[PDB]
Amino acid sequence: WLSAASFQETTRVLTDAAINCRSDKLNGLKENVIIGKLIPAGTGINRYRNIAVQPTEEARAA
Amino acid sequence: HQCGLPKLMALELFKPFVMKRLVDLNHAQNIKSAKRMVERQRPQVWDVLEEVIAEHPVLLNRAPTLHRLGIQAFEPMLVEGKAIQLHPLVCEAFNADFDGDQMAVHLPLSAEAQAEARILMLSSNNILSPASGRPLAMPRLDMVTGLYYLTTEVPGDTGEYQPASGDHPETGVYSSPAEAIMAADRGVLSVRAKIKVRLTQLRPPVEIEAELFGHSGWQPGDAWMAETTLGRVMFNELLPLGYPFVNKQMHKKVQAAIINDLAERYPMIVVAQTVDKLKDAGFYWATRSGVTVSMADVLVPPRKKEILDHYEERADKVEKQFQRGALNHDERNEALVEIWKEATDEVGQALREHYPDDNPIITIVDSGATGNFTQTRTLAGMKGLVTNPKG
Amino acid sequence: ATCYGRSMATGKLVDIGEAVGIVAAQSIGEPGTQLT
Amino acid sequence: MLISQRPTLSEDVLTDNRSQFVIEPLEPGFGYTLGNSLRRTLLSSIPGAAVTSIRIDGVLHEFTTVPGVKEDVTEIILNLKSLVVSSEEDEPVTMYLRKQGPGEVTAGDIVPPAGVTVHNPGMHIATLNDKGKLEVELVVERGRGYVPAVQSGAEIGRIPVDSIYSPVLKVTYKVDATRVEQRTDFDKLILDVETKNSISPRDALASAGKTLVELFGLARELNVEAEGIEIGP
Amino acid sequence: QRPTLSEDVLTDNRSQFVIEPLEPGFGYTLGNSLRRTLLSSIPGAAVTSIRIDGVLHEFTTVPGVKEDVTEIILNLKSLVVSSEEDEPVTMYLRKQGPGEVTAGDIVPPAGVTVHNPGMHIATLNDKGKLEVELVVERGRGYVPAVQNRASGAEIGRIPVDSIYSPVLKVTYKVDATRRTDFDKLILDVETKNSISPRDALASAGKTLVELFGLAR
Amino acid sequence: AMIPFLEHDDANRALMGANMQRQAVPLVRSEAPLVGTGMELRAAIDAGDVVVAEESGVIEEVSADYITVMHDNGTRRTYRMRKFARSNHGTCANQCPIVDAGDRVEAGQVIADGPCTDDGEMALGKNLLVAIMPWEGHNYEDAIILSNRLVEEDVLTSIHIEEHEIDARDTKLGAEEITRDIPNISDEVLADLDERGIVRIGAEVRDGDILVGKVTPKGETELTPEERLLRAIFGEKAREVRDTSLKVPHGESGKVIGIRVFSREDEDELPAGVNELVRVYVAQKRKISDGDKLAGRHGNKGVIGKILPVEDMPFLADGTPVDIILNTHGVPRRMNIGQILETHLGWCAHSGWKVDAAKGVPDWAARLPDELLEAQPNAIVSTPVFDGAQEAELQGLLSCTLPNRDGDVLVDADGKAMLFDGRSGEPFPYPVTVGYMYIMKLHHLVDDKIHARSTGPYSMITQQPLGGKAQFGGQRFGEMECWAMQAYGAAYTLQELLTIKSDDTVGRVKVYEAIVKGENIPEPGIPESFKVLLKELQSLCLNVEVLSSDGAAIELRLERAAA
Amino acid sequence: GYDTPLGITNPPIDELLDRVSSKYALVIYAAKRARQINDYYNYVGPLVEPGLQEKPLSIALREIHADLLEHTE
Numbered sequence A: 001w002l003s004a005a006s007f008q009e010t011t012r013v014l015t016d017a018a019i020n021c022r023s024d025k026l027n028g029l030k031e032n033v034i035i036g037k038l039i040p041a042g043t044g045i046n047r048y049r050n051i052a053v054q055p056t057e058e059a060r061a062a
Numbered sequence B: 001h002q003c004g005l006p007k008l009m010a011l012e013l014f015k016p017f018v019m020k021r022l023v024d025l026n027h028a029q030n031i032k033s034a035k036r037m038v039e040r041q042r043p044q045v046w047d048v049l050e051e052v053i054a055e056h057p058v059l060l061n062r063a064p065t066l067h068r069l070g071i072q073a074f075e076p077m078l079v080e081g082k083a084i085q086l087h088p089l090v091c092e093a094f095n096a097d098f099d100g101d102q103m104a105v106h107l108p109l110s111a112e113a114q115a116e117a118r119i120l121m122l123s124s125n126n127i128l129s130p131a132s133g134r135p136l137a138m139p140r141l142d143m144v145t146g147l148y149y150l151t152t153e154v155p156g157d158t159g160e161y162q163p164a165s166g167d168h169p170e171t172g173v174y175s176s177p178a179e180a181i182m183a184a185d186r187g188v189l190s191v192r193a194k195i196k197v198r199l200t201q202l203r204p205p206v207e208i209e210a211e212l213f214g215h216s217g218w219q220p221g222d223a224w225m226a227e228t229t230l231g232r233v234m235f236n237e238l239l240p241l242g243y244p245f246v247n248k249q250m251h252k253k254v255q256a257a258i259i260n261d262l263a264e265r266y267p268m269i270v271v272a273q274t275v276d277k278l279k280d281a282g283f284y285w286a287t288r289s290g291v292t293v294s295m296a297d298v299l300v301p302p303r304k305k306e307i308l309d310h311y312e313e314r315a316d317k318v319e320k321q322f323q324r325g326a327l328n329h330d331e332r333n334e335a336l337v338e339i340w341k342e343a344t345d346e347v348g349q350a351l352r353e354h355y356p357d358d359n360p361i362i363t364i365v366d367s368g369a370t371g372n373f374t375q376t377r378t379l380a381g382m383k384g385l386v387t388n389p390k391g
Numbered sequence C: 001a002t003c004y005g006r007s008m009a010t011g012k013l014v015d016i017g018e019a020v021g022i023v024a025a026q027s028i029g030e031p032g033t034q035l036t
Numbered sequence D: 001m002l003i004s005q006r007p008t009l010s011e012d013v014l015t016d017n018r019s020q021f022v023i024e025p026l027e028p029g030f031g032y033t034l035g036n037s038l039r040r041t042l043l044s045s046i047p048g049a050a051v052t053s054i055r056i057d058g059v060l061h062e063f064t065t066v067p068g069v070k071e072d073v074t075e076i077i078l079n080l081k082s083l084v085v086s087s088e089e090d091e092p093v094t095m096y097l098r099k100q101g102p103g104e105v106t107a108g109d110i111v112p113p114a115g116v117t118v119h120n121p122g123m124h125i126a127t128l129n130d131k132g133k134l135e136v137e138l139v140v141e142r143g144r145g146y147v148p149a150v151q152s153g154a155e156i157g158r159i160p161v162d163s164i165y166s167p168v169l170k171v172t173y174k175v176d177a178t179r180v181e182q183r184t185d186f187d188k189l190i191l192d193v194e195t196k197n198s199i200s201p202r203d204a205l206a207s208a209g210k211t212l213v214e215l216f217g218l219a220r221e222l223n224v225e226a227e228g229i230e231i232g233p
Numbered sequence E: 001q002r003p004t005l006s007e008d009v010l011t012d013n014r015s016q017f018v019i020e021p022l023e024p025g026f027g028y029t030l031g032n033s034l035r036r037t038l039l040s041s042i043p044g045a046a047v048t049s050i051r052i053d054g055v056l057h058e059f060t061t062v063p064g065v066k067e068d069v070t071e072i073i074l075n076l077k078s079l080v081v082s083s084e085e086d087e088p089v090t091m092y093l094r095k096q097g098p099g100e101v102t103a104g105d106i107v108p109p110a111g112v113t114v115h116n117p118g119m120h121i122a123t124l125n126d127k128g129k130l131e132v133e134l135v136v137e138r139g140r141g142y143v144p145a146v147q148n149r150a151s152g153a154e155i156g157r158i159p160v161d162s163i164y165s166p167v168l169k170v171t172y173k174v175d176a177t178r179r180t181d182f183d184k185l186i187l188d189v190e191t192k193n194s195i196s197p198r199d200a201l202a203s204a205g206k207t208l209v210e211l212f213g214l215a216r
Numbered sequence F: 001a002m003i004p005f006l007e008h009d010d011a012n013r014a015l016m017g018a019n020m021q022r023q024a025v026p027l028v029r030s031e032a033p034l035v036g037t038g039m040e041l042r043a044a045i046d047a048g049d050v051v052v053a054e055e056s057g058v059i060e061e062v063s064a065d066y067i068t069v070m071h072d073n074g075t076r077r078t079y080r081m082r083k084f085a086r087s088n089h090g091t092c093a094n095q096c097p098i099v100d101a102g103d104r105v106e107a108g109q110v111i112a113d114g115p116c117t118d119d120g121e122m123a124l125g126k127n128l129l130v131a132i133m134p135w136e137g138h139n140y141e142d143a144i145i146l147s148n149r150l151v152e153e154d155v156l157t158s159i160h161i162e163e164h165e166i167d168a169r170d171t172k173l174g175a176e177e178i179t180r181d182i183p184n185i186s187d188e189v190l191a192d193l194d195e196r197g198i199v200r201i202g203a204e205v206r207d208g209d210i211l212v213g214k215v216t217p218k219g220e221t222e223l224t225p226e227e228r229l230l231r232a233i234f235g236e237k238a239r240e241v242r243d244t245s246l247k248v249p250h251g252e253s254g255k256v257i258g259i260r261v262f263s264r265e266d267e268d269e270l271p272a273g274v275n276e277l278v279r280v281y282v283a284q285k286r287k288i289s290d291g292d293k294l295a296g297r298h299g300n301k302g303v304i305g306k307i308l309p310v311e312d313m314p315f316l317a318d319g320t321p322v323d324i325i326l327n328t329h330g331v332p333r334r335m336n337i338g339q340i341l342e343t344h345l346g347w348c349a350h351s352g353w354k355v356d357a358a359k360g361v362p363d364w365a366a367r368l369p370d371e372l373l374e375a376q377p378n379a380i381v382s383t384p385v386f387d388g389a390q391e392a393e394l395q396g397l398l399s400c401t402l403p404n405r406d407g408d409v410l411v412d413a414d415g416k417a418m419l420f421d422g423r424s425g426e427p428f429p430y431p432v433t434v435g436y437m438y439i440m441k442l443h444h445l446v447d448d449k450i451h452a453r454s455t456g457p458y459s460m461i462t463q464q465p466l467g468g469k470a471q472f473g474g475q476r477f478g479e480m481e482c483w484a485m486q487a488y489g490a491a492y493t494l495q496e497l498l499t500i501k502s503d504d505t506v507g508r509v510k511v512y513e514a515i516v517k518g519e520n521i522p523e524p525g526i527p528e529s530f531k532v533l534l535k536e537l538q539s540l541c542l543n544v545e546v547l548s549s550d551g552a553a554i555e556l557r558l559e560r561a562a563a
Numbered sequence G: 001g002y003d004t005p006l007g008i009t010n011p012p013i014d015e016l017l018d019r020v021s022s023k024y025a026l027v028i029y030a031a032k033r034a035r036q037i038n039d040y041y042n043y044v045g046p047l048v049e050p051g052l053q054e055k056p057l058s059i060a061l062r063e064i065h066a067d068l069l070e071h072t073e
């Protein structure tokens, strides 16, 4: 409902959302942009953003 | 992959970075003093500035941002003045021309931001149109004309190879390209003269390679005889070794074909360096190309009067047909429109015939550098029909 | 990725995180001002 | 009047006969004032000797082909023009190349008369087929730069060739922006020089510098007034 | 064959110079190098600052003078003057009207010479009184006004652009001759009365020799 | 009506030419166009920026300040010259007389030139030596190349006068005071302030300098702990003010032309609660520079790409270096060859001509030419629109150009001429169209448009950076820009741009602190604009709530100081 | 087969991406490594001869080019 409210016809969208007690999962990238969270795309994907990186033993040696 | 930032701009953007490096060195006592120093523009900052900016990317954006290439990353270098220097090849992507537009600069701060700028949005990494796959960072007008002049074959030019029937052998044989360069330094060889040279450092066409070598029996040392112009040699030198010798006058379309081939078969860094070398060469030879405008270079078709008189006779026939009560008013307008569209196309044809093909106004259009022939036709010849307030 | 194919910009196979939707919207809108 | 701060000349060696020189940093604008001059001096103001003409046995009128050998006349002219010869006899000198039987000819097979030298003896000239002989006369003489085919005459059997006198083969230059204190537009000159094995790039640069200095001392002779002074040479 | 350089005079401030012989396709480069050095690096003299008692900044007038201070400084740009001091010297100019203040009305300190006393500077009527103090220095090329915070200058000084170069207009041609070919270079120098074409070409050659001495 | 060869220009570029004439900035010295219409004179006169003799008489006195004419009936009339007046847009209105004492002037005659006038004619630009040829890409895609002469000789230099203003008024905690005594400022920094705290006339002000010192009553709760202890131990007074002095804004400098001041003490009328009010008028001389926007009368605009040294500018046979290089590729598609005809006629006017009359008047010059059969160098000619110069006549004049000093004809009958490469020395292989073109300096200058910001004031409502250079604002990263950023997949760049550079009130101070101490950039927080959106929704009676994975609504809302 | 790149374009992007599956993975890779290095300077590395004042991110990219680091998506 956040996405819809920000796209067009804010008034009607918000009224229907209030009536239907809607809940936004905060999963669309526009939603995350609105709330200041890493968008779920490109470098925002889970596999990418939580990568762990430690130097190998052979390199840690020298 | 570079762009020019006015000194003051960079000093303001990296202000905290420069304050940090001013406290690292002992130019500033404390951090407040580093701030005051950077604000007064004390001469110590400038050196330090060029250190902080090292390999620190920045984003350039021009509105309206229609596609992502409307925001591209660049490595910044300090420039004299209060203006941003923009690489010409990227103009296509930004729809940016230098008639006064401006652009915005953003400095990525976090490490992930700098990484996204270096890897994702680096100009060199975005040579191709994300919508069509075609190349955008490609020679556009001047470059084009430059190359188009450098790779043209001029029958009868100075130093042209002439296999002589007399006791004199043919005179257009040059051991290496450097010998041709020497010959052209003196007024002995034109860069556009059809000659024959022994090339030792350029791959030949597939067919000549198949005959004079194995299918791939070519190695950098292997030389071979080519029959081209010195210009086409200097051009094929700009493309990488591995690319076969082309030997065509480099219309924009052919440059696009070459860049497409390179992007499809080669890494992208090589393609970017190739387009940059093409840029440099095209600018130099565009300067040297002798394209100008002049009231005399705008030739007017010599048959224009008679063409117009003939179509006016047709139009008077149609108008008398209307006065006769035989034509519809909309039909009269329709007939007049057909007549005048034909007359315009005829004067355009006569113009294109009369114009020598080396005329600059023709060279600029035909080479694909910039503009269409409708403009050539409205400039000399006739504009033709013009629309209505209704349409 | 495979149903989508090559990434028109990178020339390689589209990466697993692309926002092909926005890129499509842009590729379709950018030439809009040429429609007469 | 003022003075210039720290102009230096550095060398990078790409090959044992090809090098890039860097003059940096020059005051804004002088890169172009002394770039084209140095290029033309290197390519046109160095004494060097090379082949001026040749007489081939077996073909004097047609010049079509040579019996007993694969290469045609023009390929031989090209192979010879790429010869490296250094001669001290300033008047014209003659040399002779002789070989026979199936095999292959080179630069060492030719007999260099006393005073002249051949620097690339391992070079190729032609390949003799079975029962193939080859006798040729070559003319060498000092000169400078590149002079086109000088013509022929009344003695049939000799064809003039293009004389690549210049000991330097290829020269190019560019001008990049270097930053003197507070100025990002000072000029730095870069010179790429690929030369023959007669002399190294450094020696050619030195000779060009001396010749130029003489030329411009011609103008310095008119009077001795102040001028841009430099610290290090 | 060694090359020779023969001068020719056309007026007190315009000389040609014929250099020959030169290798073919080589006179253009010499002529252009000399032209660049002449246009850029011929040491000369010019004004650095001026001071006008009644005035504290450029953008103002002086009672009784027809030219505002801006126009005065513009007219003064046209001054051709030569100083042997090699250090900041000062000239003065007083004048009460009616009358036309010209360059001659300047009292140059010994060692500095003003070469065009006729040049107009200002017009003065009954109520007009002009009193000027002009610092003259020795430089080369072109140096824009030196700020009043970049120097210890007080609020009085009115820094001015310094056009040091005494060379006016330089050009060249070459006659090419083709089996024994050669080029003859005809250089053409015109300068202000500050120094002679001969002296300008001499200093240019001196600087060019010093710079090509990087061959080592 | 002031566009020469209008009929030769398409309506788009002609509309642009009119609009851009209306943007020329007055230059220190104005030069009428060598080739114009007939409208420059009448336009300048009717405009009302030149002084005009209301009554025919004789100039009785002339000064840089006024002009007195003694009419014939004994009447005296005097005209005061506007001297270095600031205009509504910063241009410099400055009149200069063009009469000499004892001159007899008729009614309507022009007495003094205005800002953009020359001897009574509209002079919006200068006559430049132009060469039409692509030059090393530095005039690529509409850029323009200028000869450095135009800097050394101030040919495109203009004067720009800004008006800084500041008032001392009544606040909650008291009343501001304009004072030279400002908290802990170096005696040297105030070195240019008078006793009042106002900068001194004729002082050269760089950006950041003080212009008028002012202190504003500060509350006691705002005193830092450091300041609290400082005022306690040393027994400081109870002034407790803040430095609200008027400083000169970024990218600005110049000599202080003037100072005006209005005091409530004196009988000066001011608004409520406004004690004092001072205005500093600062002038600056702008030399043409990279970025500045030039244009001809034919809608042919462009920014200056590079200003070359005079030595490497292409030059004619006589060493005359061109002044401006206009890229060829720009002319034909814009349908404004008017500029080319103007270049040809301008060279004709710059060299003068003599049509050969012996044996009759040629047919090409028969129709129009009456006193145009000959013309001295630097002749002033007008080619009205829809009348005037015909193509045949243009070519004819181009044939009989007069030669230079040495009797050399430099521009041939096509309007072209050989040129040398001022860089290498070799001549350019083909003749180039050289001529004289009228170029105006349009009021779009880098000095006005350059702007950067690392950190500055924010809006009290959205808590985002203020907008506008005047307020030291930040650039707007618009919705389409966020689209672009997403298309790249630059998640972290987009987050950073939208949180720690705009709205994270603690995140941004953290980021600055981390950059200053060489530490990695912290993780971003919550945009204040989101909290504000929530508050607005609530005020709309909508119960919005943020929730945890499995939880109730999350809520939104010392040790470092003691250390 | 290519001329010596300048600054940012070094190391080449193709050879760097051959070390990873996609561009974004490389991005996060290098950013993590650079943060780790900068922590070290106040934690392991650098793993190659650091430049005169090389940016930590540049050092991390070089380390990626030399395979001196391993990762796991």
Ligand SMILES: [Mg+2]
Binding pocket: B096, B097, B098, B099, B100, B101
């Ligand atoms: Mg634009």
